[PDB]
Scaffold this motif. Structure first.
Motif: not given
Ligand SMILES: *[C@@H]1O[C@H](CO)[C@@H](O)[C@H](O)[C@H]1NC(C)=O
Ligand SMILES: *[C@@H]1O[C@H](CO)[C@@H](O[C@@H]2O[C@H](CO)[C@@H](O[C@@H]3O[C@H](CO[C@H]4O[C@H](CO)[C@@H](O)[C@H](O)[C@@H]4O)[C@@H](O)[C@H](O[C@H]4O[C@H](CO)[C@@H](O)[C@H](O)[C@@H]4O)[C@@H]3O)[C@H](O)[C@H]2NC(C)=O)[C@H](O)[C@H]1NC(C)=O
Ligand SMILES: *[C@@H]1O[C@H](CO)[C@@H](O[C@@H]2O[C@H](CO)[C@@H](O)[C@H](O)[C@H]2NC(C)=O)[C@H](O)[C@H]1NC(C)=O
Ligand SMILES: *[C@@H]1O[C@H](CO)[C@@H](O)[C@H](O)[C@H]1NC(C)=O
Ligand SMILES: *[C@@H]1O[C@H](CO)[C@@H](O)[C@H](O)[C@H]1NC(C)=O
Ligand SMILES: *[C@@H]1O[C@H](CO)[C@@H](O)[C@H](O)[C@H]1NC(C)=O
Ligand SMILES: *[C@@H]1O[C@H](CO)[C@@H](O)[C@H](O)[C@H]1NC(C)=O
Ligand SMILES: *[C@@H]1O[C@H](CO)[C@@H](O)[C@H](O)[C@H]1NC(C)=O
Lengths: 436, 129, 129, 51
Positions: A94, A136-137
């Motif tokens: 993350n 993902d992000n």
């Molecule tokens: C990474 O951390 C944030 C903290 O708020 C969270 O919202 C997000 O879902 C996380 N991503 C993963 C890969 O779990």
């Protein structure tokens, strides 16, 4: 004529070309090339000239480069055999941008107490070592996750090149071409016999040859065939060009627990501003070097031909110049040297690397604590031709290039040839053996 | 006035001079030629085999202990019609060996099949009577 | 009318003919006998040791360079009371070696302990005076 | 049987091949042996066994 009879002689100084294994030798003292088994060097080696005899040298046939190629790789793998696997560290990361983005500050949660003492152990990771997860992000994971299991290089192994010598075995000898004008091949006149070669350091680099030998009072340019676009051009410099490289970032590192009795080193915090890797190269020495090179290139490629444009061709590790200052692999944009056709280089650092090419298992560098500084000089370089063009002497874009790491040793081995000596022979004489 | 080297031929240099002059340092050249762990171990064994191979032939030919030995095989001038002086005072070892390269196995065979055979047969007969 | 083979004994065939006739091809048989990586490497070293072992004895006995050499050790007729012709014209190598198999170490010892010893002692004395 | 096969993922950087679908009827493996050659062979064998 006289009645002639057969006479047997032994010690006849004649020979034929042959390929065999040369013994290593070293200035004896877990450095990869600092093998525990190697012959101590001769403090007073001999060299003798033949003079009545010449010899046909061809640097493209010296099979000694193959011995070095395989032996060096073996030594690498052996020293780094009992190293730490990254398999349990493929956990997704993350990641956020590290405030100051080439470095990400990421967390994970593994192994979560699999009979051990572990935790999330957030750490810094480099962009060039990870693969984005666009679903993902975006989040990241080890680029090796979908390829192979790789290991973190053992902290106790040094990667400083060692000047290993090689000597002839019994019944064989090493001949040396001492003609200052010798190029790829020919009937070298000044030929001598050498008991054992000097040391050649196993310097690994792309586009420029570092810490090698110099040319005989002028730039000398060699190739198998200057007309064949499929060949490369090897440039041996009269005098070297000074380069000073640095990693200004003062980095810390942390050992983390990854299993029972198992540890892994991660990049820790960075002290001070996070700056770019770079090298400072003397424009004076570089430009004057080019002047001599261009003069020699004119002999083959024309008197008004435009040469030396920006870097292009190959994957990022071929397009960038590569070296291993301080144990970290630097990939710098050599365009700043070739950004003007007929000096500070920006640079990035990668940790998951491949020794010339690696299949399956590969090496991941550990973090290096503190700052990295080194100094070297360009002693040679490889030029590549851009391809088909108008015959007219307009352009020939000698771009930096070359990914065949074997040329980093061939560029020195060109001086030597190995032969097998045949002491047994016959000739006629005047009389019969007095046989009863 | 004459400038001189130290003692004798360094190594192989005489190979391009006449065979006559080159013969002077057969003792030097022979001695020099005659005399990680596993690769070297292999090389050592190979060196021994090469060493002994030559010694075998020199033994059989009645040449052991000599670097110059006369045989009893006549020279067939078909191989080369040059006279003694036309060879020895005019041709190098590298050149000579090439000239008769294709007769090496022939002459070696003749030494053993004819002369060695004779010397062993007649030797026994002489010792018996 | 006589039919002939090419040149000489192929390999070992003479072993069942009389020792007299078989002696003709000692030069052939000797040459032929005298002359994955690790297993072969081991075999090579063993071959060398066997090669040199024989050469050691031939050297000591004053027989080096010969395939036929006369010694100075008398034949003790206790070993076999056959005459020269009764052996050589009537018995094969395979048969003969069996007949005196149990005297091999005895006679070999006698060659070295008596004759070799004498030849080395007397040699020095003759050279001195 | 004309068989297909599939590579499956069993771990990071690790694959395994499984039997895939089968094209056409699923039949038995078998071998065809010449009864003439077999029987005549046996005849000679029996003759020698009798000894
Ligand atoms: C990474 O951390 C944030 C903290 O708020 C969270 O919202 C997000 O879902 C996380 N991503 C993963 C890969 O779990
Ligand atoms: C081309 O060739 C040049 C010259 O050989 C190379 O540059 C040198 O590379 C070596 C690599 O080790 C550098 O040596 C390191 O120096 C560190 C600090 O240097 C000062 O202190 C030492 C103390 O002995 C003095 O000798 C030196 O002159 C300076 O005063 C040391 O701290 C290092 O040792 C530490 O790191 C090693 C890592 O393996 C550990 O094993 C040690 O135990 C210790 O922890 C090391 O000695 C050297 O400084 C470089 N020269 C310069 C001017 O910077 C180029 O790298 C080479 N180029 C290529 C392409 O290979
Ligand atoms: C520099 O390279 C050139 C080109 O390869 C060499 O010239 C050739 O040498 C080969 C050697 O066998 C000959 O067969 C060719 O006929 C030569 N070509 C010409 C046109 O001369 C040259 O010898 C090299 N220089 C040195 C000093 O080695
Ligand atoms: C090579 O370098 C030397 C260094 O002094 C210089 O004098 C010489 O002129 C150079 N060669 C050429 C071709 O310029
Ligand atoms: C190149 O760098 C090495 C580093 O030790 C140095 O010894 C050498 O003198 C340099 N070459 C030139 C031409 O300055
Ligand atoms: C890095 O920063 C720390 C901060 O305390 C300092 O102690 C250390 O000497 C620095 N290292 C280098 C190589 O500057
Ligand atoms: C033999 O001598 C003559 C003398 O002119 C010379 O031309 C010839 O090359 C010589 N032969 C050899 C083998 O050199
Ligand atoms: C010796 O000759 C006789 C002749 O009849 C023969 O019977 C006997 O078998 C011979 N000995 C050997 C060793 O064959």
């Amino acid at each position: 004529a006289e009645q002639l009879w057969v006479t047997v002689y032994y010690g006849v100084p004649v020979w034929k070309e042959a390929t065999t294994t040369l013994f290593c030798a070293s200035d004896a003292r877990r450095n990869v090339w600092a093998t525990h088994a190697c012959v101590p060097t001769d403090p007073n080696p001999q060299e003798v000239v033949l003079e009545n005899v010449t010899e046909n040298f061809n640097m493209w046939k010296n099979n000694m480069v193959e011995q070095m190629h395989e032996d060096i790789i073996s030594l690498w793998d052996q020293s780094l055999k009992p190293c730490v696997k990254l398999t349990p560290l493929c956990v997704t990361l993350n990641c956020t941008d590290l405030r100051n983005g080439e470095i990400k500050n990421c967390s994970f949660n593994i192994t979560t107490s699999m009979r051990d003492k572990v935790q999330k152990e957030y750490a810094l990771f480099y962009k060039l070592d990870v693969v984005p997860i666009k679903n993902d992000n975006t989040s990241y994971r080890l680029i090796s996750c979908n390829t192979s299991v790789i290991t973190q290089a053992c902290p106790k192994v040094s990667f400083e090149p060692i000047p290993i010598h090689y000597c002839a075995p019994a019944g064989f000898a090493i001949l040396k071409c001492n003609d200052k004008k010798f190029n790829g091949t020919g009937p070298c006149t000044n030929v001598s016999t050498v008991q054992c070669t000097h040391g050649i350091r196993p310097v690994v680099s792309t586009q420029l040859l570092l810490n090698g030998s110099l040319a005989e009072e002028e730039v000398v340019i060699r190739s198998a065939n200057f007309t064949d676009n499929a060949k490369i051009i090897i440039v041996q410099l009269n005098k070297s060009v000074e380069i000073n490289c640095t990693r200004p970032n003062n980095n810390t590192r942390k050992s983390i627990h990854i299993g029972p009795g198992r540890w892994f080193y991660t990049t820790g915090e960075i002290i001070g501003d996070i700056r770019q890797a770079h090298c400072n190269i003397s424009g004076t020495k570089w430009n004057d070097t080019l002047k001599q090179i261009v003069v020699k290139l004119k002999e083959q490629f024309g008197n008004k031909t435009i040469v030396f444009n920006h870097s292009s061709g190959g994957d990022p590790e071929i397009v960038m110049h590569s070296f291993n200052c301080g144990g970290e692999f630097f990939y710098c944009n050599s365009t700043q040297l070739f950004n003007s056709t007929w000096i500070v280089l920006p640079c990035r650092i990668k940790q998951i690397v491949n020794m010339w090419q690696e299949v399956g298992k590969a090496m991941y560098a550990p973090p290096i604590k503190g700052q990295i500084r080194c100094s070297s000089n360009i002693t040679g370089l490889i030029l590549i031709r851009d391809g088909g063009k108008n015959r007219s002497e307009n352009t020939e874009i000698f771009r930096p290039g070359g990914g065949d790491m074997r040329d980093n040793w061939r560029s020195e081995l060109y001086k030597y040839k190995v032969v097998k000596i045949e002491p047994l022979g016959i000739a006629p004489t005047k009389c019969k053996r007095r046989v009863v | 006035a004459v400038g001189i080297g130290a003692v004798f031929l360094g190594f192989l240099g005489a190979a391009g001079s006449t065979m006559g002059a080159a013969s002077m340092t057969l003792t030097v050249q022979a001695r020099q030629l005659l005399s990680w762990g596993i690769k070297q171990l292999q090389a050592r064994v190979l060196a021994v085999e090469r060493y002994l191979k030559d010694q075998q032939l020199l033994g059989i030919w009645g040449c052991s202990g000599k670097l110059i030995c006369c045989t009893a095989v006549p020279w067939n001038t078909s191989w080369s019609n040059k006279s003694y002086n036309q060879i020895w005072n005019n041709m190098t070892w590298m050149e000579w060996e090439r000239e008769i390269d294709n007769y090496t196995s022939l002459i070696y065979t003749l030494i053993e099949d004819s002369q060695n055979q004779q010397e062993k047969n007649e030797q026994e007969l002489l010792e018996l009577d």
